[PDB]
């Protein structure tokens, strides 16, 4: 033998440490955002619609094929990302149909809840119920083990059209300086959480062991009154689920502070578990009180100590307390180069294996391998780090043979592991959802 890489050493230590919990979930219910992502060359699609190259010109809303072409060309010229709503329902149906039927277009399960459901459904001894706007194409795309109530099945899908360009790509006088994507949809269902009622209604019959909720972020840009009605529906529904059934909230893509504030005040006390990334974590700290709210943005890899101070603060401010009657005891934090599982002591088991398992799926799914291919991964976490900078914390050094690190702070325990980052990834949209689902699958709640 020669010396093995840090990455091979790390993946070997995971393989030994990872095992399912003693008591396993039988049934998990997941809702409510779901769609079909159609990934297609934008130039090819527009050409396929019979369009000649016009002018690049931004449009706030796309009402027409013209508007679509013009805004696409505008962003393709910048090599920049954008997202738009397309307002004409019937015209959108014809364009999405054209994109979805275009030879070589890729179709993917989309939506946090559907992606979570899909990951859980990979295990045959776990029964998954999924609600959301599920048409015939999404139903076909979903794993056969996923049960969708007939109530949650509809005639049309919610297509999200993802129009990609490559760096250097050309169409007439247009040339992309960077590779990016322009995305559009006509998705009122996910925007309004229109399947929340159907989801809530299906829980009693199904008797979930675990309920997972996502899609609140999608209400961003809707009536504040509509948002308030839906958050009350969430909280009411959860108070009707039998006591001691964990509820996980998977947080995502938030930019509105009124809404974020409201989710924290109302929904956080009603859930056992929360899942999120660096972007949402920092956004939370910026809204409310924040151990590092002052910082506008993370400057490269988020500092572990700074991250942990925010997670600590959330479980202290909003987590279960003798005064609080909050049910929140768990936060699965996942960023690119490390994941942390933070838990209020004595409510959860198997959290070493669980965080290890969340991290491992980030590698394997990114690379599209069954197991970790140690040639295609790279350890990118900091070699040493402080467990808090605010408080006086430990100085930890990474040991690839002992990758999962545990530390304690006032009845709250943290579980840290680095990620084996896929260097040549296929497609990493939806990775946080697969990470959170894996973390929960390998978690065990205890009696309330
Ligand atoms: N190339 C990669 N290899 C392994 N994990 C990744 C990679 N890229 C992203 N991740 C993780 O996947 C997640 C993407 O989904 P999200 O958290 O929803 O943004 C990030 O949180 C990263 O932690």
Of the residues 110, 140, 163, which one is the last residue of a structural domain?
Answer: 110
- Whether 350 and 328 map to the same domain: the answer is yes
Q: Is 334 in the pocket of ligand 1 (CB under 6 A)?
A: yes
- Whether 79 and 115 map to the same domain: the answer is no
C-alpha span between 417 and 338 (Å, rounded): 6
Q: Is 421 in the pocket of ligand 1 (CB under 6 A)?
A: yes
Of the residues 73, 90, 110, which one is the last residue of a structural domain?
Answer: 110
Q: Whose CA is nearest to atom 16 of ligand 1?
A: 432
R_g over Cα of the chain: 22
Pocket test of ligand 1: the residue of 7, 252, 431 to mutate, having most ligand atoms within 8 Å of its CB, is 431
Nearest ligand 1 atom, CA 252: 18
Q: Give the residue numbers of the binding site.
A: 250, 280, 433
CB burial of 309-341 (b: ≥16 within 10 Å; e: otherwise) equals bbbbbbbebbbbeeeeebbbbbbbbbbbbbbbb
- Whether 76 and 169 map to the same domain: the answer is no
Q: Measuring CA to CA, which residue among 297, 328, 304 is closest to residue 314?
A: 328
Report the Cα–Cα distance between both ends of the chain, in Å, rounded.
51
Edge-to-edge strand ranges of the sheet holding 27-31: 146-147, 127-130, 27-31, 210-213, 247-250, 273-276, 330-334, 338-344, 412-418, 405-409
- Whether 303 and 419 map to the same domain: the answer is yes
C-alpha span between 212 and 101 (Å, rounded): 33
- Whether 72 and 121 map to the same domain: the answer is no
Q: Whose CA is nearest to atom 5 of ligand 1?
A: 362
- Whether 251 and 188 map to the same domain: the answer is yes
Nearest ligand 1 atom, CA 423: 1
Residue 314's domain spans which residues? Answer: 1-34+111-448
- Whether 150 and 60 map to the same domain: the answer is no
Note the resolution in Å, 1 decimal. Answer: 3.0
Q: Whose CA is nearest to atom 1 of ligand 1?
A: 422
Q: Decide if 401 is catalytic.
A: no
- Whether 45 and 194 map to the same domain: the answer is no
Of the residues 110, 131, 151, which one is the last residue of a structural domain?
Answer: 110
Q: Which residues fall within 8 angstroms of residue 199, CB to CB, at 6 or more apart?
A: 29, 31, 32, 131, 132, 152
Residue among 157, 209, 373, 433 flagged as catalytic? 433
- Whether 91 and 132 map to the same domain: the answer is no
């Amino acid at each position: 033998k020669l010396a093995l890489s840090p990455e091979s050493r790390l993946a070997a230590a995971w393989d030994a440490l990872i095992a399912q919990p003693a008591r396993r979930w039988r049934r998990v219910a997941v809702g409510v955002n779901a769609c079909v992502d159609v990934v297609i060359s934008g130039v090819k699609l527009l050409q396929a619609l019979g369009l000649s190259p016009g002018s690049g010109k931004d449009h706030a809303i796309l009402h027409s094929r013209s508007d679509l072409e013009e805004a696409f060309l505008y962003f393709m010229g910048k090599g920049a990302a954008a997202e738009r709503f397309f307002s004409d329902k019937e015209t959108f149906h014809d364009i999405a149909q054209a994109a979805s039927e275009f030879p070589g277009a890729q179709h993917y399960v989309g939506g946090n809840a559907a992606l979570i459901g899909q990951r859980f459904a990979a295990n045959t001894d776990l029964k998954v119920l999924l609600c959301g706007p599920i048409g015939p194409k999404l139903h076909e795309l979903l794993d056969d083990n996923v049960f969708v109530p007939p109530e949650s099945l509809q005639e049309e899908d919610e297509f999200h059209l993802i129009l990609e360009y490559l760096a250097g790509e050309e169409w007439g006088p247009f040339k992309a300086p960077h590779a990016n994507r322009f995305i559009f949809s006509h998705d009122l269902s996910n925007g309004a959480m229109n399947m929340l009622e159907v989801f809530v209604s299906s829980l009693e019959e199904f008797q979930p062991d675990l309920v997972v909720l996502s899609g609140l972020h999608m209400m961003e840009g809707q009536s504040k009154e509509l948002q308030r009605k839906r958050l009350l529906e969430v909280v009411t529904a959860i108070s009707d689920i039998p006591t001691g059934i964990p509820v996980h909230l998977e947080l995502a893509s938030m930019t509105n502070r009124e809404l974020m504030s409201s989710i924290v005040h109302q929904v956080f006390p009603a859930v056992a578990s929360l899942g999120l990334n660096e972007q949402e974590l920092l956004f939370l700290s910026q809204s409310a009180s924040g151990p590092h709210s002052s910082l506008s943005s993370w400057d490269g890899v988020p500092d572990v100590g700074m991250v942990s101070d925010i997670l600590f603060w959330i479980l202290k401010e909003h987590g279960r307390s003798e005064n609080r009657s909050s049910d929140l005891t768990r936060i699965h934090f996942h960023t690119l180069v490390y994941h942390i599982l933070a838990t209020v002591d004595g409510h959860w088991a198997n959290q070493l294996a669980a965080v290890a398992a969340g991290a491992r799926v980030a590698g394997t799914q990114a690379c599209a391998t069954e197991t970790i291919d140690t040639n295609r991964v790279s350890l990118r976490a900091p070699q040493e780090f402080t467990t808090s900078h605010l408080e006086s914390g430990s100085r930890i050094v990474l040991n690839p043979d002992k990758p999962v690190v545990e530390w304690h702070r006032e009845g709250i325990t943290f579980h840290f592991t680095p990620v084996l980052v896929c260097k040549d990834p296929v497609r990493t949209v939806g990775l946080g959802d697969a990470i959170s689902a894996e973390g929960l699958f390998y978690s065990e709640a205890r009696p309330d």
